[PDB]
Each structure stands twice: as C-alpha cells, then as structure tokens.
Design a protein around this ligand. Structure first.
Ligand SMILES: *[C@@H]1O[C@H](CO)[C@@H](O)[C@H](O)[C@H]1NC(C)=O
Ligand SMILES: *[C@@H]1O[C@H](CO)[C@@H](O)[C@H](O)[C@H]1NC(C)=O
Lengths: 48, 49
C-alpha cells in the first residue's frame, strides 16, 4: 500500500526478515490479476 | 514429440499446476469445476475462482 511505486527498470527490493509473514493481510486488499506461485503452494504459505 | 506436439500448441493435455488439495495416490480426480483459492461458491472465472 505504498504511496509511490518504483519503475520496472528500477524495481525496489524490500527486505523482510525477523517477523511473521501473514498473507491474509495481503489477501485483504488483493485485487489479484496475477497470483502465480512457483515452487511453493499458496495454501501452504502459513505453515512454512 | 513426433505425434504429440501441435504446431499452434497442444492444449488437449492439461497439467494441473494449482488445486484445492493434493491428489491421493491411485486416485483419479476428474473435477473439472473451477478451483477456488479463497472461500465462496465461485460462479465465474475470476480472482481465486
Ligand atoms: C496503505 O494503508 C496503510 C495502512 O492503513 C497506510 O498506513 C498507508 O498510508 C496506505 N498507503 C497509501 C494510502 O498510499
Ligand atoms: C526504495 O528505494 C530506495 C532507493 O534505493 C530505498 O532507499 C528505499 O528503502 C526503497 N523502499 C522500499 C520500500 O524498499
């Protein structure tokens, strides 16, 4: 929900560590045109 | 590849990449209805439906 997003050639890399990753928060505001998960099942994101 | 590769793409063979669950061994699931990634009785092909 950032106010401004960086360009594609200057994609911004955010580091996420030392915290619990709650994907339900992401789903709360997700108009997911694309939700493609590779190598990890999306339903198994809450127990890994 | 000689007899199973359509020039425009052989879409008759469907490999399931995401599903509601994981197939039980020796269990042929032919559920052609849409898989729902959320929770609702999805009617049209949309997000999580
Ligand atoms: C996105 O929502 C968060 C949480 O309410 C808020 O802090 C942030 O300012 C919002 N960003 C916007 C509106 O660009
Ligand atoms: C966006 O990029 C700038 C410049 O590299 C960096 O300082 C900032 O932390 C980045 N923001 C996020 C949210 O990753």
């Amino acid at each position: 929900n950032a106010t401004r997003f960086a360009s594609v050639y200057a994609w911004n890399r955010t580091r996420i560590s030392n915290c619990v990753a709650d994907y339900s928060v992401l789903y709360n505001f997700a108009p997911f045109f694309a939700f493609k998960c590779y190598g990890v099942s999306p339903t198994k994101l809450n127990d890994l | 590849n000689k007899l199973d590769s359509k020039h425009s793409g052989n879409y008759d063979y469907w490999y399931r990449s995401f599903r509601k669950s994981k197939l039980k061994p020796f269990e042929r699931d032919i559920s052609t209805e849409i898989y729902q990634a959320g929770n609702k009785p999805c009617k049209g092909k949309g997000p999580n439906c």
